[PDB]
């Protein structure tokens, strides 16, 4: 019954997820894995269904990690969905500054894919700006992809001076 829950959470079927999650006894089916190691929390956050991920948090789910170290907030910021992002941020705050296997945070992905409101949402909260495995900040990773709107909304922010301070003198790429 794991594959119907993965299909119903991967496409925003809220009533099918309510009918599958009536038995509140066994939570081993709720936090189960995938072939690529994704919980239904990860699938519901990847496609950007806020009510499904709110239901899975209300029933009780654990912020596990992908095989590549991603989180639900990493998928929601890779997609640029502000609603699931806002729900995950309103539940907990200890999941924001979280690293993947490559050292990227969620703000790195939200700036790499060029989502302005996602960057503004993680930036209005405390984002804990850190470098990459290749010593790249999120501002570097936005400038190399020529994303005009996200670097403009970094400039319009209040954290801009702080965003200017951090880089690597030794790194030949992010000069």
């Amino acid at each position: 019954k794991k594959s119907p829950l993965h299909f119903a959470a991967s496409y925003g079927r809220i009533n099918t997820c309510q009918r599958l999650l009536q038995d509140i006894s066994d939570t081993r089916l709720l936090n189960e894995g995938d072939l690529h190691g994704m919980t239904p929390l990860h699938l519901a956050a990847k496609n950007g269904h806020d009510k499904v991920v709110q239901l899975l948090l209300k029933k009780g789910a654990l912020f596990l990690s992908d095989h590549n170290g991603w989180t639900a907030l990493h998928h929601a910021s890779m997609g640029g969905y502000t609603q699931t992002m806002k729900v995950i941020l309103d539940t907990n705050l200890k999941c924001t500054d979280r690293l993947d296997e490559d050292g990227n945070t969620a703000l790195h992905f939200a700036a790499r894919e060029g989502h302005a409101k996602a960057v503004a949402l993680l930036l209005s909260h405390n984002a804990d700006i850190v470098l990459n495995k290749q010593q790249a900040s999120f501002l570097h990773l936005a400038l190399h992809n020529k994303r005009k709107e996200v670097v403009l909304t970094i400039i319009r922010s209040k954290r801009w001076d702080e965003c200017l301070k951090i880089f690597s003198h030794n790194s030949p790429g992010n000069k």
């Binding site: 594959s3 119907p4 496409y11 925003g12 079927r13 496609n47």
Partner: peptide, 16 residues
């Protein structure tokens, strides 16, 4: 609109 179609679609005899 297409994602809304899949969200509201009725699936019988194609599940699991």
């Amino acid at each position: 609109l297409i994602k809304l179609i899949i969200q509201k679609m009725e699936i019988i005899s194609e599940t699991e």
